[PDB]
Ligand binder design. Structure first.
Ligand SMILES: *[C@@H]1O[C@H](CO)[C@@H](O)[C@H](O)[C@H]1NC(C)=O
Ligand SMILES: *[C@@H]1O[C@H](CO)[C@@H](O)[C@H](O)[C@H]1NC(C)=O
Ligand SMILES: *[C@@H]1O[C@H](CO)[C@@H](O)[C@H](O)[C@H]1NC(C)=O
Ligand SMILES: *[C@@H]1O[C@H](CO)[C@@H](O)[C@H](O)[C@H]1NC(C)=O
Ligand SMILES: *[C@@H]1O[C@H](CO)[C@@H](O)[C@H](O)[C@H]1NC(C)=O
Ligand SMILES: *[C@@H]1O[C@H](CO)[C@@H](O)[C@H](O)[C@H]1NC(C)=O
Ligand SMILES: *[C@@H]1O[C@H](CO)[C@@H](O)[C@H](O)[C@H]1NC(C)=O
Ligand SMILES: *[C@@H]1O[C@H](CO)[C@@H](O)[C@H](O)[C@H]1NC(C)=O
Lengths: 208, 228, 342
């Protein structure tokens, strides 16, 4: 009933954060901020009314069912996770984390077939590595015999590197041994701003 | 000045019950309902229910019916939360909260201006499971002017954390150890990878060293190209 | 030309100065004789907004009833604020009489006459009166007793149905009698009798009304989730004694969905140690009087709360509520508001 977006927002100090919440019900909407290790704090209530201690840099707006929290001129104390609320219902949250800017870097994509050691365990994990890219925003789609995969993949992302300011992403596709031996073409397609076209890395089961 | 102070964090096991307190001050306790919200990393904040101090009237969230109980002590102005039949899904930080607008004649429950400092509750089994360590093999052909990726998959362990080094710590450049993910089985898994010059694939030996303190497990795995 | 305003209302009644009954004694000194020839002026081409949940008339009635109870139902021991007050606690004659509330000069009461009026919003048929109708200060939880009935259909009343923290008032259009009795020769034990046929038919109509407000979802009743006895049970004062009745059987979903017919008998008990509804604390009263203690009342309404939470199931759950006695007064003052002439 409350759909908050985006999930993750990677910005630098001084930039503006735009967090939106789509509702289907109607009532006063509130926005909360949770700094790391600290209790959530009321930022905006009743759509656009600023709570005590909240700078005019924070402002709420509404167009139709979509409510927006905009944070101008990001300061250190602004980063954290934000939540919208109506009555007992809360959004999924928007993580706003510090990003250090650098030039666009496309990822180096690698794919790893399941180990032969693991295939004796009845499980098959296929790993796709996205190495050293910027910006953070990246999409990974798994295809098995050119069929889109859903609900059998997990992704993990590193924190921005202290030296080269890049990110790396690891996606794992898990199938049963029986289901794995059933198909031939295993592929992970990678879309990122540094690529002029989505890049696909794949292997054919059995052959080396 | 309105204040809410909560009891200390605790660690429970599956099947147990937990109780936590929230002492209120700075206002007329009976005038305003008290709420309990829990926060877990990854999930939506979850409203558990409210409790009106004056006669102890309560309203529990549907999905918690029969597991939760909310009481209060008038004299000490302290609210209490009890949750029974704890599972992994109850692992969270528990907050008590009260609305911004509260007069003797009226209130609005849901603009939570006031929050306790929070009470972290961990629910997990005392069991520990050692990781499986599978090699993520570089490739088949050696290239003399390109970089190769290799690593190991550290799968099905519990609880957190595992650490990974390469070559007893001698290899650090280009190493990436990813945050663990929680699988559907309730067991964790992560990957560690490193990019190396492809021309060193038949010369240098690459061992990943996996450490899992809770299960007293130290495993070394040589990651080499598949012979074919 | 007038405007919504707040003022100090004066009370009127038909109390008897010869009567030893508590409400009568209070009203004799607190109120004036009633007007045999009232005056009501129907206003044509007039549309006014009302809000029963922000009606300050309710606040004044609350203070009056608290004053009435405090001056009368005096405990033997009063336990509040970690202190102890020992007073005399003689038995009294207790039977609520109707109270009219009225506006002074310069002010007047506007009355809504729309038959389907739900408590908030605009009213087409508005009349001008100096006094309200006779309202009995009946203090109770879960069930509204001895009140006025809705004219047409059953009316659902709430400041905001989507807000689960707001009380729902169900206003009945056909009363159902509740016959509570403490027999003569455990002296604290009692019971209430209700005609199952009448009740279950009304209750069924209540769920169908609720369906109209909740998208034809399955309507389910449940016992209260928790709280003090005053709210988890049907709490009320009869003849001076504090009764607590277990209403679990009153909300039997099986009968609103064979055998359910008959005379429902709710288990009750008279307590001498109570929590005060005035938000004060614990009060201690003398044991009940001997002989048959009985009172027959009209159930004229129901106090409900609705379960909330991040759900998605095809049903709404309702539970008997109350505790906020101001809600009792709202259920009778809902069609009234005070305005100031210039
Ligand atoms: C219901 O509550 C909302 C805020 O939650 C408020 O804007 C609205 O006016 C209320 N509706 C009524 C009829 O009072
Ligand atoms: C009562 O009627 C008003 C006016 O249309 C409406 O705004 C409100 O939602 C209604 N309340 C209920 C409980 O039906
Ligand atoms: C109870 O209701 C009956 C009709 O249903 C009515 O005659 C009687 O006066 C009512 N008693 C009250 C309101 O005390
Ligand atoms: C009471 O209202 C219900 C609808 O809510 C209606 O079916 C019934 O006929 C009414 N009873 C009367 C007017 O006596
Ligand atoms: C109330 O119930 C008693 C039995 O407990 C019965 O003797 C009496 O006649 C009943 N009164 C009415 C008005 O039905
Ligand atoms: C209950 O009320 C009905 C009328 O609605 C009446 O016919 C019936 O006899 C009553 N039952 C008992 C047990 O008195
Ligand atoms: C009321 O009576 C029912 C009988 O079925 C019982 O289950 C319930 O516990 C009672 N309530 C209280 C508060 O004792
Ligand atoms: C309701 O009114 C009747 C008389 O009309 C009286 O006998 C009874 O005690 C009253 N009930 C309550 C709860 O005051």
């Amino acid at each position: 009933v409350l759909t908050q977006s985006p999930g993750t927002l990677s910005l630098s100090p001084g930039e503006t954060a735009i967090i939106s919440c789509r509702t289907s019900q109607y009532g006063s909407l509130a926005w909360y901020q949770q700094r790391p290790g600290q209790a959530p704090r009321l930022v905006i209530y009743s759509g656009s009314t600023r709570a005590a201690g909240i700078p005019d840099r924070f402002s709420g707006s509404r167009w139709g069912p979509d409510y927006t929290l905009t944070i101008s001129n990001l300061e250190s104390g602004d980063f954290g996770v934000y939540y919208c609320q109506q009555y007992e219902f809360f959004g999924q949250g928007t993580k706003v984390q510090v990003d250090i800017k650098r030039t666009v870097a496309a990822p180096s994509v690698f794919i790893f077939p399941p180990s032969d050691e693991q295939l004796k365990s009845g499980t098959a994990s296929v790993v796709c590595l996205l190495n050293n890219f910027y910006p953070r925003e990246a999409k990974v789609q798994w295809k098995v015999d050119n069929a889109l995969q859903s609900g059998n993949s997990q992704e993990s992302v590193t924190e921005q590197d202290s030296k080269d300011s890049t990110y790396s992403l690891s996606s794992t596709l898990t199938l049963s041994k029986a289901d794995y031996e059933k198909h031939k073409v295993y592929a992970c397609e990678v879309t990122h701003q540094g690529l002029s076209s989505p890049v696909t890395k794949s292997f054919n089961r059995g052959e080396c | 000045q309105v204040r809410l102070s909560q009891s200390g964090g605790q660690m429970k096991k599956p099947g147990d019950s937990m109780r936590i307190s929230c002492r209120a001050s700075g206002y007329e306790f009976i005038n305003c309902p008290i709420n309990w919200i829990r926060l877990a990393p990854g999930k939506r904040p979850e409203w558990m229910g409210w409790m009106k101090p004056r006669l102890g009237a309560v309203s529990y969230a549907r999905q918690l019916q029969g597991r939760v109980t909310m009481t209060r002590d008038m004299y000490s102005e302290t609210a209490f939360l009890e949750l029974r039949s704890l599972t992994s899904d109850d692992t969270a930080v528990y907050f008590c909260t009260r609305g911004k607008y509260c007069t003797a004649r009226d209130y609005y429950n849901w603009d939570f201006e006031h929050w306790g400092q929070g009470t972290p509750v961990t629910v997990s089994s005392a069991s520990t499971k050692g990781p499986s360590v599978f090699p993520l093999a570089p490739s088949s052909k050696s290239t003399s002017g390109g970089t190769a990726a290799l690593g190991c998959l550290v799968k099905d362990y519990f609880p957190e954390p595992v650490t990974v080094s390469w070559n007893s710590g001698a290899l650090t450049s280009g190493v990436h150890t990813f945050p663990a993910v929680l699988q559907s089985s309730g067991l964790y898994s992560l990957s560690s990878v490193v990019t190396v010059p492809s021309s060193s694939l038949g010369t240098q030996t690459y061992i990943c060293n996996v450490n899992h303190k809770p299960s007293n497990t130290k495993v070394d795995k040589k990651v080499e190209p598949k012979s074919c | 030309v007038w405007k919504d305003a707040d003022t100090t209302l004066f009370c009127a009644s038909d109390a008897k100065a010869h009567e030893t009954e508590v409400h009568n004694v209070w009203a004799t000194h607190a109120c004036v004789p009633t007007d045999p020839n009232p005056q009501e002026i129907h206003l044509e081409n007039v549309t006014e907004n009302f809000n029963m949940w922000k009606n300050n008339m309710v606040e004044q009635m609350q203070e009056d009833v608290i004053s009435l109870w405090d001056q009368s139902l005096q405990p033997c021991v009063k336990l509040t604020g970690g202190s102890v007050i020992k007073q005399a606690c003689p038995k009294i004659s207790f039977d609520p009489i109707p109270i009219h509330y009225c506006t002074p000069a310069g002010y007047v009461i506007l009355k809504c006459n729309d038959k389907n009026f739900n408590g908030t919003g605009p009213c087409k048929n508005v009349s001008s009166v100096q006094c309200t109708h006779g309202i009995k200060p009946v203090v109770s939880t879960q069930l509204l007793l001895n009140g006025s009935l809705a004219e047409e259909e059953i009316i659902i009343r709430s400041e905001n149905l989507t807000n689960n923290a707001k009380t729902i008032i169900v206003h009945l259009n056909k009363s159902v009698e509740i016959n509570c009795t403490r027999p003569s020769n455990d002296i604290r034990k009692a019971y209430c009798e209700i005609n199952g046929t009448k009740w279950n038919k009304v209750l069924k109509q209540v769920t169908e009304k609720l369906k109209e407000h909740f998208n034809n979802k399955t309507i389910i009743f449940q016992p209260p989730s928790g709280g003090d006895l005053e709210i988890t049970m049907h709490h009320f004062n009869c003849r001076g004694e504090f009764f607590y009745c277990n209403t679990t059987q009153l909300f039997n979903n099986t009968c609103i969905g064979k055998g359910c017919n008959g005379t429902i008998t709710l288990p009750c008990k008279i307590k001498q140690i109570i929590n005060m509804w005035q938000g004060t604390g614990q009060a201690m009263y003398a044991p009940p009087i001997d002989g048959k203690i009985n009172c027959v009342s009209n159930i004229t309404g129901i106090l409900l709360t609705r379960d909330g939470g991040a759900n998605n199931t095809s049903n709404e759950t309702f539970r008997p509520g109350g505790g906020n006695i101001k809600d009792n007064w709202r259920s009778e003052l809902y069609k009234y508001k005070v305005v100031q002439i210039e």
